[PDB]
Structures are given as C-alpha cells and as structure tokens.
Amino acid sequence: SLSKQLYIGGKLITSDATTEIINPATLEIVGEISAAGINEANMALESAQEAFSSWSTTPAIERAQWMLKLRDAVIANEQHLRECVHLEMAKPWQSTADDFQMLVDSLNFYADAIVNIADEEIKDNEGTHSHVLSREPVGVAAAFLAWNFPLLNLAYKLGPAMAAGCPLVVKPSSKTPLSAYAVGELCEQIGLPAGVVNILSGMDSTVGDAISASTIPSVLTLIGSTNVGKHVIATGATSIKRYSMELGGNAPAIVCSDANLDNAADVICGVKFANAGQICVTPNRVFVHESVADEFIEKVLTRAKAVKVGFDKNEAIDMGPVMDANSWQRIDELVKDAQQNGAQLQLGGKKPTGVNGYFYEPTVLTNVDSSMKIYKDEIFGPVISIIIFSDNEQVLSDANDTDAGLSSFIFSSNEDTISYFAKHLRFGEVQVNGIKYSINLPHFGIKQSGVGVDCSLLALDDYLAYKRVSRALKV
Amino acid sequence: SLSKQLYIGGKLITSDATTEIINPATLEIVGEISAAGINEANMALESAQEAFSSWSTTPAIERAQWMLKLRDAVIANEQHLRECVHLEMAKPWQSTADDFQMLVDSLNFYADAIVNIADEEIKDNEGTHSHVLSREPVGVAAAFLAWNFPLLNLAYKLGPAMAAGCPLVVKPSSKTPLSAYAVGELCEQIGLPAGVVNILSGMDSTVGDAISASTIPSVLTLIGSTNVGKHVIATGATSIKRYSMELGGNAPAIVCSDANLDNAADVICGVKFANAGQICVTPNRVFVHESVADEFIEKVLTRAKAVKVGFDKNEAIDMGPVMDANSWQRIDELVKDAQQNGAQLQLGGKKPTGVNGYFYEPTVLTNVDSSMKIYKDEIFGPVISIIIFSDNEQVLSDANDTDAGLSSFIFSSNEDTISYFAKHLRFGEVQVNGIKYSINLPHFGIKQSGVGVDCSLLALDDYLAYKRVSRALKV
Numbered sequence: 001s002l003s004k005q006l007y008i009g010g011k012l013i014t015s016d017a018t019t020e021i022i023n024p025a026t027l028e029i030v031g032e033i034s035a036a037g038i039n040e041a042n043m044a045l046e047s048a049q050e051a052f053s054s055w056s057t058t059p060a061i062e063r064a065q066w067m068l069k070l071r072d073a074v075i076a077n078e079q080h081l082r083e084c085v086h087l088e089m090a091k092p093w094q095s096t097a098d099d100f101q102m103l104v105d106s107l108n109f110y111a112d113a114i115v116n117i118a119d120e121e122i123k124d125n126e127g128t129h130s131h132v133l134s135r136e137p138v139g140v141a142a143a144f145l146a147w148n149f150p151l152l153n154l155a156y157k158l159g160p161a162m163a164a165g166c167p168l169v170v171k172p173s174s175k176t177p178l179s180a181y182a183v184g185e186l187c188e189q190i191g192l193p194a195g196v197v198n199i200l201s202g203m204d205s206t207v208g209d210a211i212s213a214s215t216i217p218s219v220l221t222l223i224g225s226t227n228v229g230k231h232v233i234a235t236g237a238t239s240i241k242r243y244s245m246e247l248g249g250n251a252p253a254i255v256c257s258d259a260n261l262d263n264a265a266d267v268i269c270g271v272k273f274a275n276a277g278q279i280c281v282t283p284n285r286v287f288v289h290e291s292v293a294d295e296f297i298e299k300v301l302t303r304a305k306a307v308k309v310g311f312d313k314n315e316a317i318d319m320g321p322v323m324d325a326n327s328w329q330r331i332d333e334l335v336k337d338a339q340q341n342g343a344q345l346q347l348g349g350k351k352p353t354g355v356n357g358y359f360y361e362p363t364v365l366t367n368v369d370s371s372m373k374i375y376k377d378e379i380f381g382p383v384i385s386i387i388i389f390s391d392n393e394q395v396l397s398d399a400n401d402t403d404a405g406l407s408s409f410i411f412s413s414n415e416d417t418i419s420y421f422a423k424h425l426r427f428g429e430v431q432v433n434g435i436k437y438s439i440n441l442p443h444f445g446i447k448q449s450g451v452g453v454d455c456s457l458l459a460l461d462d463y464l465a466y467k468r469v470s471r472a473l474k475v
Numbered sequence: 476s477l478s479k480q481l482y483i484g485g486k487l488i489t490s491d492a493t494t495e496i497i498n499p500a501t502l503e504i505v506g507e508i509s510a511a512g513i514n515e516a517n518m519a520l521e522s523a524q525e526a527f528s529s530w531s532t533t534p535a536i537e538r539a540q541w542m543l544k545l546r547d548a549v550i551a552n553e554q555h556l557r558e559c560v561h562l563e564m565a566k567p568w569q570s571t572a573d574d575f576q577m578l579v580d581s582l583n584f585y586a587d588a589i590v591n592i593a594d595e596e597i598k599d600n601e602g603t604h605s606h607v608l609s610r611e612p613v614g615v616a617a618a619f620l621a622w623n624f625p626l627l628n629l630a631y632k633l634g635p636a637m638a639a640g641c642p643l644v645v646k647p648s649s650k651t652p653l654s655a656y657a658v659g660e661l662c663e664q665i666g667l668p669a670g671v672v673n674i675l676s677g678m679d680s681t682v683g684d685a686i687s688a689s690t691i692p693s694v695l696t697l698i699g700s701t702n703v704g705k706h707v708i709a710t711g712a713t714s715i716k717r718y719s720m721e722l723g724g725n726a727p728a729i730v731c732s733d734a735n736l737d738n739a740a741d742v743i744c745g746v747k748f749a750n751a752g753q754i755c756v757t758p759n760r761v762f763v764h765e766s767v768a769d770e771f772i773e774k775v776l777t778r779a780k781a782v783k784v785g786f787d788k789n790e791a792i793d794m795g796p797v798m799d800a801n802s803w804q805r806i807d808e809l810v811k812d813a814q815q816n817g818a819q820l821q822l823g824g825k826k827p828t829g830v831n832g833y834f835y836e837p838t839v840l841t842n843v844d845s846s847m848k849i850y851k852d853e854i855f856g857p858v859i860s861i862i863i864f865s866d867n868e869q870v871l872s873d874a875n876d877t878d879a880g881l882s883s884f885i886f887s888s889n890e891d892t893i894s895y896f897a898k899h900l901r902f903g904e905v906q907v908n909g910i911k912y913s914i915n916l917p918h919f920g921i922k923q924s925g926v927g928v929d930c931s932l933l934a935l936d937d938y939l940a941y942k943r944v945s946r947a948l949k950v
C-alpha cells in the first residue's frame with residue numbers, strides 16, 4: 001500500500017513515469033509514487049477551476065463537515081500516516097506525532113473558524129448609504145511544501161483552503177510525497193467532491209513552473225527557501241495573484257547575564273536537535289554573554305551528548321538523519337569553513353563511525369564570529385553555533401544583522417532587558433525564555449523571510465476576498 | 476512658481492533633465508519639472524532607507540502631528556494645489572476639489588487611525604505561555620500613481636505610509652506631476668524629516684524599473700493598469716516584497732425592469748461624464764432590460780446633452796478633455812469599431828468641431844454585444860455603452876464574463892433581485908441604486924483588478940507588519 005497514485009479530479013490515476021522514495025537512514029527503497037507531468041498538472045488545475053463554482057457556493061457548515069469527515073479518516077489511519085513520514089524521511093517515531101496531530105488540529109481549527117465568520121457593517125459618515133463588508137472564496141489555490149514537516153506543512157494549507165471554499169492543488173516535495181499521497185487516498189475514500197483537493201508531485205522546472213505560470217490559480221503559497229520564493233513570484237507574474245510566502249530564517253538566540261542557563265540550554269538543545277535541526281524557527285546564532293559562557297557551554301554539551309541518534313520505530317529515538325546528501329554536504333561545509341576561520345569544534349562535526357545513512361552528530365561550535373559563512377547562512381542542521389558577546393546594545397545590532405526576519409530568542413530574568421530586545425528585534429516572532437507554537441498562534445516572518453501567515457485566524461486572509469455592498473437609502 | 480524641483484532627502488534639488496507639462500485642452504506649456512534619472516532614483520531610495528530607523532521609532536502621536544502639520548499647509552495652499560491639477564490635465568475647477576479634499580481627508584483619517592492601534596493578546600490553550608500580537612512599520616514603500624486623480628491617488632498612499640512609519644518614495648505620472656511636486660514643496664516648507672517623503676518623476680524603463688528592481692523597498696504599490704501591474708510584480712522579484720495593486724476594471728451596470736429609471740440615469744451619467752469618464756469604478760457595460768430600454772435611453776440622452784464641456788476656471792464646466800492623443804485615439808477606435816459591428820451611435824462619437832484640445836463629446840452607444848471590443852476592453856472615456864438583456868440569470872453571467880473585479884452596479888426595486896445580484900456578482904464592490912466612495916469605505920478589486928485595499932483602516936495592513944512576543948510563564 002506504499003505504491004500510491006495521483007489524486008486528481010477525485011480519482012486515483014497513474015502516471016507516465018514513476019519516482020521511488022529512498023529512506024535517508026537505511027538508503028533502501030521504501031515506496032513509489034506516480035510522478036506527475038505537465039499534462040497531469042494541467043489536469044489538476046482545470047479540475048480545481050471547474051469545482052470552484054460549486055465548492056465556493058457550498059455552505060460553510062457543509063464544507064466544515066467535509067473537513068471533519070477527512071479528520072475522522074485521518075484519526076482512523078494514524079499509524080499509516082505516521083509510518084509514511086517515518087519511512088520517507090527517517091523521522092523519529094515520536095516526532096511523527098507532531099506531523100499527524102497538526103493535521104487533526106488544523107482540520108478542527110478551521111472547520112470551527114469558518115462557521116464563526118460574520119459580515120460587518122461600515123458606518124456611513126454622511127447618512128446616505130448602508131455598507132456591508134463580507135468575505136468570499138478567492139479562487140483556486142496552489143501550494144508548494146517543504147519536506148521538513150510533510151504533514152504539518154500540508155496541514156497549514158489544507159485546513160484554511162478547504163474551509164474558505166478554495167479548491168487546492170498541493171505539490172509536496174519529491175523527497176517526502178508519500179504521506180501527502182496517503183491523505184489524497186483518504187479524500188478518495190470518503191468521497192470528497194472532485195477538484196476540491198488535488199495532490200501531485202513532479203519536477204520543479206516542469207510541474208512546479210507550470211502551476212505558477214498558469215493563469216488559473218488565484219493564490220500561490222510556498223513553504224520553502226527565499227530563493228525559490230523569488231522564482232515563484234516572478235514565474236507567477238503571468239496573471240495577478242496573491243502570494244503567501246513562509247521562507248528562510250536566521251534566528252538569533254541571546255543568552256544574557258541573568259538568564260536561567262538550565263532553561264536556556266533545555267530549550268535551545270531541544271529545538272536544535274529535534275528533526276535534526278531542520279526547523280525554520282530554530283536558533284541559528286546562539287549569542288552567549290562572557291560571564292556565563294563557560295557555564296552555558298558545559299550544560300549544552302551534556303544535553304547534546306544525551307541525544308539518542310538513529311532510526312528505529314521500536315526505540316525511543318530522539319534525532320534522525322538529515323534529508324539527503326546535498327543537505328549533509330552543505331551542513332558539513334559550513335562547519336568545516338568555520339574551523340578554518342578560528343571556530344572551535346567542541347562536539348560532533350562528523351557522521352558517526354561506520355554508520356549507514358546521512359546522519360550528522362549533534363554538533364557544538366564555539367568562537368564563531370560575524371564573518372563566517374555559518375553565521376550569514378541558514379544551517380538547517382543539528383549544529384549549535386555559539387558567539388560570545390559582552391554588551392547588550394552590540395548584540396542587538398548583531399542579532400538584526402541579517403536579511404532574515406522569522407523567529408528570535410531572548411533568555412533573561414531582567415524585565416528591562418526583555419522589553420529592550422522584544423521591541424527592537426526585527427523579527428516576526430520573539431520567544432522569551434522558551435518556545436511555543438500552535439495551530440491558533442500566528443506563525444510568520446518579516447523582511448526576506450516571507451509575506452503571509454500560517455496558523456491562527458489570520459491564515460484565512462489569503463484565501464478570502466472582501467466584498468462591499470453599498471446601497472443607497474434615499475432612493 | 477510653476478517650475479518645481481525634485482524633493483529627495485528633505486531638500487529640493489535639480490537635475491540635468493526637464494519635462495515640460497502640456498495642458499490637454501489648450502496644448503500650451505503650463506509648467507516644467509526637474510525630471511529624475513536612475514541616479515536620483517537611488518538617492519531617494521537610499522535616503523528613505525536611512526530614514527527608516529528614526530521614522531519608524533518616532534511615536535505614533537508624533538508622526539500624526541507631522542501629518543496634521545502637512546494637512547495645515549495643504550489647506551493653506553488649496554488654490555495652488557487645485558490650480559496645478561487644473562493646469563496639468565485640464566480638470567474642471569469644481570472637480571479639482573475631489574483631488575484636494577481627499578488629501579486632507581486622508582491625512583485626517585490615518586492620523587486618528589494610527590493613534591488608536593492597540594496590541595492584542597492571544598489565548599494559550601495550554602496555559603504555559605503568554606502571547607502579545609503587535610504591529611510595526613514594515614519598511615520603505617514605493618508608489619506608482621495613475622494620472623486620472625493626481626492628488627487623490629497620492630492621498631491613498633501618503634496617508635497610510637506616513638502614519639504607519641514607512642518612508643515613502645512616490646513616482647507620480649509623467650503626465651500629471653505638478654500637483655505632487657507642489658506637495659513635496661509643502662513638505663520641505665514645514666521641515667519634514669529627510670527621507671520620510673520623496674517625490675520624483677521620470678522614465679518608466681529607467682526610473683520606474685530601478686525602483687521596483689531595487690532591494691530597498693519592502694512594499695510596492697501601484698495605481699494603474701493590469702499589464703503594468705504584472706510588469707511590476709516580475710520586476711520587483713529581485714527580493715521578497717509586498718504588492719498592493721489597484722488595477723483595471725470593467726464595471727457592469729444592470730438596470731432591471733423595476734428600477735427607478737430617473738435615479739439610474741442620474742447615477743450612471745454623473746460618473747460616466749465626470750473626469751471625462753476616466754474613472755476606474757465607472758460603468759463600462761450598461762445592461763438595460765427590454766421593457767425599459769426606450770425609456771432609459773431617452774433619460775440618458777437628455778442628461779448627456781446637458782453636460783457642459785470645456786476648460787475655463789471661471790465657468791461651471793462639468794467635463795474636460797481626455798488625457799492625451801493616445802487616450803483620444805484609443806477611445807475613438809473602440810467607438811468606430813463598435814459601429815462597424817452593428818452599434819448605433821446616438822450621441823457624440825466625435826470631437827466637437829473647430830475646438831482645440833483632445834475633447835471627446837459625451838457619447839451614447841446602443842446595440843452593443845459581447846463580441847465587440849468596446850465590451851471586452853475598459854473604455855476609460857465619456858462613452859455610455861448600452862447592452863439590452865431580458866433574463867436576469869443571463870445578464871448575471873454576462874456581467875461576470877470578464878477578467879476584471881472592481882466595481883459593479885445593480886439598479887432595482889426588488890429585494891430578491893438585489894440580493895441575487897449582490898451575492899453572485901464577482902466584483903469587489905456592488906453598488907445598489909447609487910454610488911458611494913469615501914476615505915473610510917474600503918476600495919478594492921478582486922480577480923485581475925489587483926490585490927490590496929485603498930481607504931478604510933484596511934489600507935494600513937500593507938504598511939504594518941505583525942510581531943508575536945511569546946514568553947514562558949514558568950521561568
């Protein structure tokens with residue numbers, strides 16, 4: 001049941017080609033999917049377009065019931081969905097719960113949110129007209145998803161698009177498409193109307209470019225890198241479209257003099273090694289003060305040494321391997337470039353001895369400065385990069401010394417210090433003394449980290465168009 | 476006082492080039508401006524960027540005081556501002572009040588709006604963290620403005636950008652730059668901080684493309700045509716930017732059998748001949764039922780024949796000329812092409828004899844059908860294009876048979892017909908039995924009419940970025 005077909009137009013159809021999924025830990029074939037071509041891409045766009053007139057006029061409560069029906073099928077098929085993520089990217093068995101649960105959480109949140117949307121009246125200052133502001137479905141939506149959270153990233157778009165009445169064309173990453181294809185099988189099982197949801201994977205220069213260049217979609221959304229976001233914006237300029245982009249980050253983490261070093265180490269290591277550091281909001285530059293530098297490093301090394309690395313559903317594995325060889329080499333060249341410029345390797349910086357798979361050990365780097373490539377670029381790996389600072393006003397300028405604008409962290413027990421950083425940090429998210437994300441809390445970045453919001457009620461703004469109906473009262 | 480210079484970096488500077496302004500009625504040189512080049516365009520972008528650190532950190536109340544101080548200078552120079560609009564495009568003196576008053580209304584609305592912005596807390600469903608959602612200035616904003624309302628189009632962007640703390644680079648139309656250059660003189664007069672507002676006019680291939688392709692602006696906004704919107708989106712893809720575009724329209728106006736014909740003729744003729752029909756929300760296709768066809772045309776003709784056409788500050792002129800020869804020729808070709816395919820010319824259709832200037836007479840055309848070019852394309856002139864329908868469901872499909880999604884009009888006395896069209900009309904605005912626009916009422920389009928809103932509190936959304944501050948409660 002791991003040889004899955006395309007879900008286009010409410011039907012499970014096969015392809016002209018085929019792509020196999022290879023597990024990055026065992027490097028064996030774990031499944032195959034029917035790969036889409038330009039013809040299959042146009043088939044999904046046309047079926048999504050034809051379904052707009054009926055799906056957008058379907059009452060919100062009826063759409064919400066279709067979402068809850070898919071949610072019931074997702075809960076019933078929990079083991080298969082988590083196993084799909086487990087096999088396609090060697091994600092630890094317990095961390096696959098985050099992917100699966102977010103899909104249930106998203107379907108629940110936006111089924112309930114859409115039935116609470118109400119029109120609003122605008123006051124006429126002249127007393128000559130009445131005005132009613134309503135919200136309606138925009139059109140077809142197309143989504144390109146990163147591979148780091150296959151089902152979570154899918155949930156961020158599937159939930160809102162279904163609730164807002166927008167037929168959706170999903171393109172999962174060719175590296176992790178099995179779990180999304182399984183969701184399409186669930187929509188075919190419950191009998192979801194044709195064209196509402198379409199799931200296909202294919203080559204970027206053909207399938208992906210064709211979906212963006214098409215004049216059918218009204219909204220293009222991407223969870224990925226900044227460079228691909230620029231390409232999608234330019235490629236989609238064949239028509240006027242909405243863009244919702246959640247792109248790369250370079251999160252600073254500031255551990256101050258008065259910070260709880262045990263809490264800062266627990267939080268930082270927890271998210272630096274979960275998903276092998278392949279997380280958009282994880283710290284990329286760990287700023288540590290002089291007076292607590294040596295004490296904070298000893299705490300991070302102890303936690304890093306206690307990270308269970310491997311690939312086994314039966315075992316309590318904490319961290320798996322990175323996605324593929326390109327990721328492994330990119331991370332390794334950043335660690336090795338830092339050492340040649342004076343950085344000190346305290347732990348890791350290599351693959352375990354004689355191990356099969358693209359595993360990278362929990363790495364701890366010190367003596368990092370602003371001129372190194374590991375400082376300017378997004379690591380997206382299990383590398384804790386530590387920079388020593390002394391002054392708060394200087395570490396703030398260094399923290400803002402990046403084109404990214406996603407997440408950021410400040411660890412301190414001083415209210416004047418917390419207020420100072422929370423205000424002047426140029427990032428969409430400021431985490432204070434911890435980390436927290438949820439389906440109801442908005443996730444977003446500013447500057448080059450994208451435009452648009454995932455989670456919370458604001459995620460519906462990309463899929464709903466306003467309409468003002470103004471009526472003359474005199475005649 | 477009709478030779479004005481660039482307003483860049485808080486100073487009025489000259490250039491090596493000059494653009495002469497010709498009145499489209501008298502065809503005489505009425506003024507001259509210092510034309511900007513690529514070097515001057517980079518001077519404005521650099522000064523706007525350097526101003527962001529200080530202008531964005533200026534308190535909202537203090538920024539609103541600068542807006543009200545500019546408003547006072549605007550009110551003091553009301554005659555000169557309306558004079559520049561009157562001379563650059565031959566706009567009737569009575570109609571120059573709309574441009575002027577909207578600039579005062581916009582500065583008033585958004586100065587009061589920015590001081591009432593408040594943070595919002597978000598509930599944590601787990602009780603482990605606190606969350607505060609705030610809004611902050613995004614960055615530098617650049618605006619390209621259409622010529623049809625020089626000061627009103629400037630008002631829509633200047634008001635929000637100043638209030639939201641975003642240094643603004645404005646490029647007015649090369650055809651109508653005098654009025655905006657005078658606003659920059661008022662800015663230099665009151666001592667507005669340097670880089671907050673920059674006003675330069677230049678060539679599209681050089682000045683306009685260098686502004687979009689620059690990686691400095693965070694927001695690119697355009698009041699113009701759809702094809703230019705697509706060009707700005709692609710050209711701005713050198714970095715991740717926000718796009719706020721209010722583009723072309725093709726408004727249908729449905730006069731049903733039960734409509735007040737006197738009210739429909741008053742509303743349609745008023746906005747069809749105001750500004751010589753060079754209004755984006757004006758009806759482009761007038762649908763009239765068979766039973767009221769002969770009676771509605773007679774009412775429209777008597778109102779069209781009563782339009783005073785000319786160019787005189789001391790006379791109550793209702794309508795002036797179109798913008799230039801290209802506009803005149805484009806409109807004339809649509810009328811002549813329509814007559815070749817069966818349209819009946821009832822009035823106008825030509826320039827008045829002997830008169831100087833690009834005047835086009837109030838024009839009434841009947842027997843228009845869906846195949847004609849004047850039906851598929853935006854007229855943007857003083858031409859009332861009349862199509863006759865019989866079935867309400869058919870005219871609704873014809874009304875929606877367009878790529879545009881701006882304004883739309885329904886004239887009826889039946890509540891079931893009004894509700895039917897108000898729901899199924901796929902347009903941003905549905906005007907019932909009249910027309911209403913104001914600084915507090917949102918103005919926007921859907922589909923290819925662009926993305927983003929002008930006027931209302933929603934206009935601040937393009938210039939304000941969110942920020943979530945989450946704090947662990949246990950620590």
Ligand SMILES: NC(=O)c1ccc[n+]([C@@H]2O[C@H](COP(=O)([O-])OP(=O)(O)OC[C@H]3O[C@@H](n4cnc5c(N)ncnc54)[C@H](OP(=O)(O)O)[C@@H]3O)[C@@H](O)[C@H]2O)c1
Nearest residue numbers: 144145146173174204208209224225228246247248249280
């Ligand atoms: N802001 C957030 O919430 C968030 C969340 C997760 C990740 N991220 C960011 O994502 C990045 C890592 O993800 P990644 O390296 O997989 O991103 P990526 O290389 O930019 O790819 C992202 C997705 O876009 C697809 N794609 C690539 N080129 C395309 C084209 N020309 N047309 C259409 N689609 C195309 C890819 O499919 P293929 O895989 O088939 O090429 C992939 O599924 C990091 O920078 C991280 O910061 C951000």
Ligand SMILES: NC(=O)c1ccc[n+]([C@@H]2O[C@H](COP(=O)([O-])OP(=O)(O)OC[C@H]3O[C@@H](n4cnc5c(N)ncnc54)[C@H](OP(=O)(O)O)[C@@H]3O)[C@@H](O)[C@H]2O)c1
Nearest residue numbers: 619620621648649679683684699700703721722723724755
């Ligand atoms: N939705 C609305 O609220 C609204 C309001 C007003 C008008 N409109 C639309 O605007 C259209 C008529 O205006 P128009 O004929 O002036 O439209 P246009 O030809 O697209 O010009 C719009 C503005 O953009 C500038 N521009 C042109 N090319 C550019 C480039 N490459 N880079 C930067 N800027 C550039 C033009 O400057 P130059 O004049 O110097 O070339 C002009 O000021 C109509 O279709 C109407 O529907 C819409």
